[PDB]
Amino acid sequence: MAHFKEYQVIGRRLPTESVPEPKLFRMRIFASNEVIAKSRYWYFLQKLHKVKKASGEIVSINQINEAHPTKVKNFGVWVRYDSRSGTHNMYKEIRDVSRVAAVETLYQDMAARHRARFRSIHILKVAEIEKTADVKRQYVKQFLTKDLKFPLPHRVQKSTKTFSYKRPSTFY
Amino acid sequence: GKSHGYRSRTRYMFQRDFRKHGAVHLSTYLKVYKVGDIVDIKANGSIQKGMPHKFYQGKTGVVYNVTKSSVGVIINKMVGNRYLEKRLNLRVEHIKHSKCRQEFLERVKANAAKRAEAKAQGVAVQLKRQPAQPRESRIVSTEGNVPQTLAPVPYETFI
Amino acid sequence: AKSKNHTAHNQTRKAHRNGIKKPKTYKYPSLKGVDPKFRRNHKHALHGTAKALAAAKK
Amino acid sequence: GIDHTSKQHKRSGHRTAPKSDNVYLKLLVKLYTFLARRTDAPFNKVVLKALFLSKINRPPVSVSRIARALKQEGAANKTVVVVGTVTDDARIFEFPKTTVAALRFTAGARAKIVKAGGECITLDQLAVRAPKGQNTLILRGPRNSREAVRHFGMGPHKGKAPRILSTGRKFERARGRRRSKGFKV
Amino acid sequence: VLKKNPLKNKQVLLRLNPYAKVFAAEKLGSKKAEKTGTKPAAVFTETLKHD
Amino acid sequence: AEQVAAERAARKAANKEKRAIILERNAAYQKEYETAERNIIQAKRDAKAAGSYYVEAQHKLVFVVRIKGINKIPPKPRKVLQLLRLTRINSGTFVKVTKATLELLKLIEPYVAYGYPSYSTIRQLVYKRGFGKINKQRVPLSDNAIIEANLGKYGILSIDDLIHEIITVGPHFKQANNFLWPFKLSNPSGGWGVPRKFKHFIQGGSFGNREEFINKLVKSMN
RNA sequence: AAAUAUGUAAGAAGUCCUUGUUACUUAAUUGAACGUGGACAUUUGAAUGAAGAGCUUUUAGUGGGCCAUUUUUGGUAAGC
RNA sequence: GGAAUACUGCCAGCUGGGACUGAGGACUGCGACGUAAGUCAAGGAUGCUGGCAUAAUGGUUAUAUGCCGCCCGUCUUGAAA
RNA sequence: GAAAUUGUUGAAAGGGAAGGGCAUUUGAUCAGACA
Ligand SMILES: [Mg+2]
Ligand SMILES: [Mg+2]
Ligand SMILES: [Mg+2]
Ligand SMILES: [Mg+2]
Ligand SMILES: [Mg+2]
Ligand SMILES: [Mg+2]
Ligand SMILES: [Mg+2]
Ligand SMILES: [Mg+2]
Ligand SMILES: [Mg+2]
Ligand SMILES: [Mg+2]
Ligand SMILES: [Mg+2]
């Protein structure tokens, strides 16, 4: 829905006299800012435990930064999304340098190919593929070839003026 | 044509509770009412005499008259754009002592005690109620309570 | 030439322009409809206490 | 776009100046406007506001009403102030020696007050004697004794008088008044 | 007759709040904070990087 | 003519004493503002170093801005807006957070944008758009005399004392807050940042509870 | 057995101590209602707001409606 | 193990360019800078300079150009019909 | 000796209507102060 950041949200139920110091629950949330991340925390917690915002509290929220933002990685993502009729599971693989920059690619692909909005997509798990040959999508394996090499034919150059005085060329 | 009798649309209003039919318990006739008491109206289906109209069901009034087996109740009824004063003659089976103001009698009694106790000690007794104030700061210890990571579950049928 | 029969539309808006007035409460409310036997003896009680108060400040 | 909580450009609803064109009355208004502004005495503000009233809002105050007010405990030596006309009453046979200030005195009321040993003064003389209204007493006549009042609020079971021209046996005593003829009110 | 906004007119800013003179003189808007060397516990960082 | 220098000297001397009191009070408020914020920051560091989590106290003050016109409003939300003195679009008013006031905010949720103001936002609002209600009149806050004349009995004698009672909810918050005329803001200079305002801030609109993000919005409108 | 709507209460016309009247009532100075005198001021009894509150007289026009979201009846449906 | 920077926030930090406005008409108030006398951007614009003194500005009127503009009165839920 | 209506002279505009509102160009015409 915007540029994505990864937030760690830790919540808890309100302590009572019968059971003081209740259990702590944590989950990673991808959100535009801090306000959305806390709201998404209660959305997922209400699907797992008998608790809501009124009877619970947020213990701590922290932003997660990539350990190695400048290393190319292969990411496998599991998603649960709702189509116009029914719910479907899906596994896709995205090659990028960070989790935040790979989730945004996933949301663009889901909207472009399946017409799925943000409100109807659940991110089950995002994991990094560590070993080659564990990639099972051919559109990613083709970039893992030894000594990758490809040209860029038919270059188009932007023009700042309305008129040009020579026929352009598309060489590169 | 249309029917607008005295007891119309009272099929379920005047029914007795489940497994609560028969005679009336004796404590109803032993309670005493005075002028100025605040009571609420709830009609009893077993007694067809002195039974209030369906409008006054679940309404609270003030006693203004006492009789042999009945009392007078004053209720303000909204008619049009103003309120009118209504006087009802209802038997004691159809009313009970409302507890809306009964709780208020404890706080005024407690306010007098608290004011007297703090009169010889400190000013500003704080004799006013306050709403639920926002929670203060706290520290949550993780000793034996390490957070557990949760993830959304996939889709399944189980039908 | 049939027409409309009944509606409550716009009725509550007219009532809230100047209406919805809580009735005035007066000290010493009217004693209409109270027990006649109680009222008879209450009149003599008020008459008696008037004489007693006057006798103290004669 | 303003969500008004009340009516806009609403007038106060009280008289600010007299409706009459009497030059002498407007002189009294000018005199007491100055007093009500530079004396901060509640008496002056009351008198200034009372000068704007209409005829029905200024009922006559009889001499008997004045005498009864003088029988109050400790009010025997006060100046009675009546913003209006003072009339004479023949029902009373004794009158004190007080001082009364009023707009108008009838030919009979003035004679009775003077004969008793008192004096009749105008409102402008009172400001000289009592700039702040010291030792004063304001009396007002009855408003609900007016003939038009008894017909106000006419309705069933109200006990009000009806607007009728001729009163008699055959005038509004039939059906609707007695049980023998249909019903009673 | 004419309202003048403080923070755009310095003289009005000195009319009200006379402490503004002291605040600017001591450069209290750029006060340096005391350095601390506390380190988070191993529990906090492990939970932070936990999958 | 007498009383030409005697009373002037006495009056100027009285003014100097009042200036000294305001100077000393503003110094004290500055110290407690700095001390309080550093303690909160230090507490968070200490909790992390001890393997715990520091849960900061819930906010007690909110600033509510009406973002919709006066047409097509259901009655119950309309009445609540009047009780919060929000009669024209882009008006603001500080609200103390209690259990009773939270239910009011939920009813008028689609029509207002509110959050948690900071000290900087509060100071700029009062200095630039601070007007007082004196004898049912809107009087600009251009001098400390009017504050003293209308809030002296509550211990407030300066514009910074008025700000102090707002940022820190004191015993006289109700009288101080009701003294201020409702703020009249303009449209944001940079825009609202969204194509459609009338959606919740979570879904990508304007209204709702945007917490500390309100400070960026208010400054644009102020 | 909900949600939404709905009645009442949140003090001075209040609370407490003592004792005066009556043809009502009680086995009974028992009780009921109404009172004299004494004690507790506006953190005086939750929140917010209040271009102030309350009251009266008189009279015009109107008494063919319609549309949208939601609930909903008849009809296959309708710009019914 | 020691720094840098990005992001967010604060400054009663400094400073350049452009546009609109000049209401009020003796003094009075709150302040600032000064040992003082005084001064000041402090309860609303002044200083300096040029051309012209007339159809030049401006008014009225006809026309042209850009955009907009359906025929009034009436009955009606609804009229340019 | 008014208007509807009409003749002559003079000025102007006109590609399936004319008339109107805001602003300005052009032509014709006109008041005000020269202190
Ligand atoms: Mg029978
Ligand atoms: Mg009809
Ligand atoms: Mg809408
Ligand atoms: Mg722009
Ligand atoms: Mg938009
Ligand atoms: Mg020109
Ligand atoms: Mg044109
Ligand atoms: Mg057009
Ligand atoms: Mg028709
Ligand atoms: Mg028409
Ligand atoms: Mg002609």
mmCIF file of N, CA and C in Angstrom, chain B residues 73-139:
data_model
loop_
_atom_site.group_PDB
_atom_site.id
_atom_site.type_symbol
_atom_site.label_atom_id
_atom_site.label_comp_id
_atom_site.label_asym_id
_atom_site.label_seq_id
_atom_site.Cartn_x
_atom_site.Cartn_y
_atom_site.Cartn_z
ATOM 1 N N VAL B 73 -48.424 5.747 41.093
ATOM 2 C CA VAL B 73 -47.118 5.944 40.475
ATOM 3 C C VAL B 73 -47.223 7.094 39.484
ATOM 4 N N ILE B 74 -46.238 7.989 39.507
ATOM 5 C CA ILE B 74 -46.181 9.126 38.596
ATOM 6 C C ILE B 74 -45.095 8.869 37.563
ATOM 7 N N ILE B 75 -45.475 8.898 36.287
ATOM 8 C CA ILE B 75 -44.561 8.656 35.178
ATOM 9 C C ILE B 75 -44.718 9.776 34.160
ATOM 10 N N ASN B 76 -43.593 10.291 33.673
ATOM 11 C CA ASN B 76 -43.594 11.313 32.634
ATOM 12 C C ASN B 76 -43.585 10.635 31.269
ATOM 13 N N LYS B 77 -44.610 10.909 30.469
ATOM 14 C CA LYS B 77 -44.781 10.302 29.156
ATOM 15 C C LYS B 77 -44.633 11.366 28.078
ATOM 16 N N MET B 78 -43.808 11.080 27.074
ATOM 17 C CA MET B 78 -43.574 12.020 25.984
ATOM 18 C C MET B 78 -44.720 11.940 24.983
ATOM 19 N N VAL B 79 -45.447 13.042 24.825
ATOM 20 C CA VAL B 79 -46.592 13.122 23.921
ATOM 21 C C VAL B 79 -46.353 14.311 23.002
ATOM 22 N N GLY B 80 -45.971 14.040 21.757
ATOM 23 C CA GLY B 80 -45.731 15.098 20.797
ATOM 24 C C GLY B 80 -44.359 15.725 20.933
ATOM 25 N N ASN B 81 -44.307 16.946 21.466
ATOM 26 C CA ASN B 81 -43.047 17.645 21.681
ATOM 27 C C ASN B 81 -42.800 17.977 23.148
ATOM 28 N N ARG B 82 -43.655 17.516 24.057
ATOM 29 C CA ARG B 82 -43.489 17.785 25.478
ATOM 30 C C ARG B 82 -43.826 16.523 26.260
ATOM 31 N N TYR B 83 -43.603 16.579 27.569
ATOM 32 C CA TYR B 83 -43.878 15.470 28.469
ATOM 33 C C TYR B 83 -45.108 15.780 29.309
ATOM 34 N N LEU B 84 -45.948 14.770 29.508
ATOM 35 C CA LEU B 84 -47.125 14.884 30.352
ATOM 36 C C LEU B 84 -46.959 14.017 31.592
ATOM 37 N N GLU B 85 -47.712 14.360 32.632
ATOM 38 C CA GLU B 85 -47.677 13.637 33.894
ATOM 39 C C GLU B 85 -48.788 12.596 33.909
ATOM 40 N N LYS B 86 -48.426 11.357 34.230
ATOM 41 C CA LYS B 86 -49.355 10.237 34.250
ATOM 42 C C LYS B 86 -49.432 9.662 35.655
ATOM 43 N N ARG B 87 -50.642 9.311 36.079
ATOM 44 C CA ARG B 87 -50.879 8.715 37.385
ATOM 45 C C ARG B 87 -51.548 7.362 37.202
ATOM 46 N N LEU B 88 -50.946 6.326 37.778
ATOM 47 C CA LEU B 88 -51.398 4.956 37.606
ATOM 48 C C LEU B 88 -51.746 4.347 38.956
ATOM 49 N N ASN B 89 -52.774 3.505 38.960
ATOM 50 C CA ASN B 89 -53.183 2.751 40.142
ATOM 51 C C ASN B 89 -52.835 1.288 39.887
ATOM 52 N N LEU B 90 -51.723 0.836 40.457
ATOM 53 C CA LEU B 90 -51.211 -0.506 40.224
ATOM 54 C C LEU B 90 -51.068 -1.253 41.542
ATOM 55 N N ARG B 91 -51.436 -2.531 41.527
ATOM 56 C CA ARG B 91 -51.253 -3.374 42.695
ATOM 57 C C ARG B 91 -49.777 -3.723 42.875
ATOM 58 N N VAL B 92 -49.444 -4.194 44.080
ATOM 59 C CA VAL B 92 -48.048 -4.413 44.448
ATOM 60 C C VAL B 92 -47.400 -5.580 43.720
ATOM 61 N N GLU B 93 -48.187 -6.456 43.090
ATOM 62 C CA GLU B 93 -47.593 -7.567 42.353
ATOM 63 C C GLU B 93 -46.862 -7.091 41.104
ATOM 64 N N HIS B 94 -47.196 -5.901 40.608
ATOM 65 C CA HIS B 94 -46.669 -5.405 39.345
ATOM 66 C C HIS B 94 -45.472 -4.480 39.506
ATOM 67 N N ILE B 95 -45.019 -4.227 40.734
ATOM 68 C CA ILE B 95 -43.941 -3.284 40.990
ATOM 69 C C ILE B 95 -42.931 -3.918 41.938
ATOM 70 N N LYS B 96 -41.754 -3.299 42.002
ATOM 71 C CA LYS B 96 -40.725 -3.676 42.960
ATOM 72 C C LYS B 96 -39.828 -2.470 43.196
ATOM 73 N N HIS B 97 -39.066 -2.527 44.284
ATOM 74 C CA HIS B 97 -38.152 -1.442 44.620
ATOM 75 C C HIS B 97 -37.010 -1.393 43.614
ATOM 76 N N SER B 98 -36.897 -0.277 42.901
ATOM 77 C CA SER B 98 -35.812 -0.109 41.947
ATOM 78 C C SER B 98 -34.495 0.118 42.677
ATOM 79 N N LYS B 99 -33.427 -0.473 42.148
ATOM 80 C CA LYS B 99 -32.099 -0.346 42.730
ATOM 81 C C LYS B 99 -31.247 0.700 42.024
ATOM 82 N N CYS B 100 -31.838 1.479 41.115
ATOM 83 C CA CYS B 100 -31.082 2.523 40.433
ATOM 84 C C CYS B 100 -30.590 3.580 41.413
ATOM 85 N N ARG B 101 -31.449 3.994 42.343
ATOM 86 C CA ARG B 101 -31.078 4.974 43.355
ATOM 87 C C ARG B 101 -30.594 4.336 44.648
ATOM 88 N N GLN B 102 -30.859 3.043 44.849
ATOM 89 C CA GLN B 102 -30.426 2.381 46.075
ATOM 90 C C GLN B 102 -28.911 2.418 46.225
ATOM 91 N N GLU B 103 -28.174 2.203 45.132
ATOM 92 C CA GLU B 103 -26.720 2.306 45.184
ATOM 93 C C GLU B 103 -26.273 3.720 45.532
ATOM 94 N N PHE B 104 -27.035 4.730 45.108
ATOM 95 C CA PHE B 104 -26.690 6.113 45.416
ATOM 96 C C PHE B 104 -26.753 6.404 46.910
ATOM 97 N N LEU B 105 -27.576 5.669 47.660
ATOM 98 C CA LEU B 105 -27.668 5.902 49.098
ATOM 99 C C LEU B 105 -26.402 5.469 49.826
ATOM 100 N N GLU B 106 -25.639 4.534 49.257
ATOM 101 C CA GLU B 106 -24.387 4.134 49.890
ATOM 102 C C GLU B 106 -23.301 5.189 49.714
ATOM 103 N N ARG B 107 -23.205 5.788 48.525
ATOM 104 C CA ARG B 107 -22.135 6.750 48.273
ATOM 105 C C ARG B 107 -22.302 8.005 49.123
ATOM 106 N N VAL B 108 -23.535 8.496 49.268
ATOM 107 C CA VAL B 108 -23.766 9.661 50.117
ATOM 108 C C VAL B 108 -23.449 9.330 51.570
ATOM 109 N N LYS B 109 -23.780 8.112 52.005
ATOM 110 C CA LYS B 109 -23.372 7.665 53.332
ATOM 111 C C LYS B 109 -21.856 7.562 53.433
ATOM 112 N N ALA B 110 -21.205 7.046 52.387
ATOM 113 C CA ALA B 110 -19.751 6.939 52.398
ATOM 114 C C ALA B 110 -19.083 8.302 52.280
ATOM 115 N N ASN B 111 -19.692 9.233 51.541
ATOM 116 C CA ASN B 111 -19.117 10.570 51.420
ATOM 117 C C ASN B 111 -19.107 11.289 52.762
ATOM 118 N N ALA B 112 -20.171 11.128 53.551
ATOM 119 C CA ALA B 112 -20.207 11.739 54.876
ATOM 120 C C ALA B 112 -19.130 11.153 55.781
ATOM 121 N N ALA B 113 -18.936 9.835 55.726
ATOM 122 C CA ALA B 113 -17.908 9.202 56.545
ATOM 123 C C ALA B 113 -16.514 9.651 56.124
ATOM 124 N N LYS B 114 -16.245 9.660 54.815
ATOM 125 C CA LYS B 114 -14.920 10.036 54.334
ATOM 126 C C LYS B 114 -14.611 11.498 54.634
ATOM 127 N N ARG B 115 -15.601 12.381 54.481
ATOM 128 C CA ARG B 115 -15.388 13.789 54.801
ATOM 129 C C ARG B 115 -15.080 13.978 56.281
ATOM 130 N N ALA B 116 -15.807 13.274 57.152
ATOM 131 C CA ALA B 116 -15.575 13.401 58.587
ATOM 132 C C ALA B 116 -14.205 12.861 58.981
ATOM 133 N N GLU B 117 -13.795 11.734 58.393
ATOM 134 C CA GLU B 117 -12.504 11.147 58.739
ATOM 135 C C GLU B 117 -11.351 12.057 58.338
ATOM 136 N N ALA B 118 -11.442 12.678 57.166
ATOM 137 C CA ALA B 118 -10.387 13.547 56.664
ATOM 138 C C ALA B 118 -10.551 15.000 57.091
ATOM 139 N N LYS B 119 -11.629 15.339 57.804
ATOM 140 C CA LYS B 119 -11.816 16.719 58.239
ATOM 141 C C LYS B 119 -10.723 17.146 59.209
ATOM 142 N N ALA B 120 -10.335 16.258 60.120
ATOM 143 C CA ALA B 120 -9.287 16.558 61.084
ATOM 144 C C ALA B 120 -7.888 16.284 60.552
ATOM 145 N N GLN B 121 -7.758 15.792 59.319
ATOM 146 C CA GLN B 121 -6.449 15.450 58.772
ATOM 147 C C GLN B 121 -6.072 16.305 57.569
ATOM 148 N N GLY B 122 -6.878 16.324 56.511
ATOM 149 C CA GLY B 122 -6.499 17.054 55.320
ATOM 150 C C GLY B 122 -7.653 17.581 54.496
ATOM 151 N N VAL B 123 -7.442 18.733 53.857
ATOM 152 C CA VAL B 123 -8.457 19.367 53.020
ATOM 153 C C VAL B 123 -8.466 18.683 51.658
ATOM 154 N N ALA B 124 -9.509 18.944 50.864
ATOM 155 C CA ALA B 124 -9.717 18.284 49.574
ATOM 156 C C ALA B 124 -9.828 16.768 49.753
ATOM 157 N N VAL B 125 -11.005 16.347 50.214
ATOM 158 C CA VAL B 125 -11.244 14.933 50.462
ATOM 159 C C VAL B 125 -11.381 14.147 49.167
ATOM 160 N N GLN B 126 -11.600 14.823 48.036
ATOM 161 C CA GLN B 126 -11.831 14.176 46.742
ATOM 162 C C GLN B 126 -13.067 13.270 46.804
ATOM 163 N N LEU B 127 -14.218 13.928 46.924
ATOM 164 C CA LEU B 127 -15.508 13.252 47.034
ATOM 165 C C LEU B 127 -16.228 13.166 45.695
ATOM 166 N N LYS B 128 -15.489 13.133 44.591
ATOM 167 C CA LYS B 128 -16.069 13.038 43.259
ATOM 168 C C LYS B 128 -15.516 11.821 42.532
ATOM 169 N N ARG B 129 -16.390 11.139 41.797
ATOM 170 C CA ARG B 129 -15.982 10.009 40.979
ATOM 171 C C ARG B 129 -15.217 10.495 39.757
ATOM 172 N N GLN B 130 -14.387 9.617 39.204
ATOM 173 C CA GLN B 130 -13.632 9.933 38.006
ATOM 174 C C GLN B 130 -13.772 8.813 36.983
ATOM 175 N N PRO B 131 -13.645 9.122 35.692
ATOM 176 C CA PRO B 131 -13.706 8.064 34.674
ATOM 177 C C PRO B 131 -12.458 7.195 34.678
ATOM 178 N N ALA B 132 -12.438 6.165 33.836
ATOM 179 C CA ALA B 132 -11.287 5.272 33.754
ATOM 180 C C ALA B 132 -10.118 6.011 33.115
ATOM 181 N N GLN B 133 -9.148 6.409 33.932
ATOM 182 C CA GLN B 133 -8.001 7.159 33.453
ATOM 183 C C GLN B 133 -7.077 6.265 32.633
ATOM 184 N N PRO B 134 -6.299 6.852 31.721
ATOM 185 C CA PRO B 134 -5.350 6.051 30.940
ATOM 186 C C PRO B 134 -4.329 5.366 31.836
ATOM 187 N N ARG B 135 -3.913 4.174 31.415
ATOM 188 C CA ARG B 135 -2.978 3.383 32.204
ATOM 189 C C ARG B 135 -1.623 4.073 32.296
ATOM 190 N N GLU B 136 -0.964 3.891 33.438
ATOM 191 C CA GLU B 136 0.335 4.489 33.693
ATOM 192 C C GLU B 136 1.443 3.620 33.102
ATOM 193 N N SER B 137 2.686 4.050 33.303
ATOM 194 C CA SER B 137 3.832 3.309 32.799
ATOM 195 C C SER B 137 4.030 2.018 33.588
ATOM 196 N N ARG B 138 4.701 1.060 32.952
ATOM 197 C CA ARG B 138 4.959 -0.230 33.574
ATOM 198 C C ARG B 138 6.141 -0.887 32.878
ATOM 199 N N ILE B 139 6.690 -1.906 33.532
ATOM 200 C CA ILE B 139 7.783 -2.704 32.991
ATOM 201 C C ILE B 139 7.319 -4.151 32.914
#
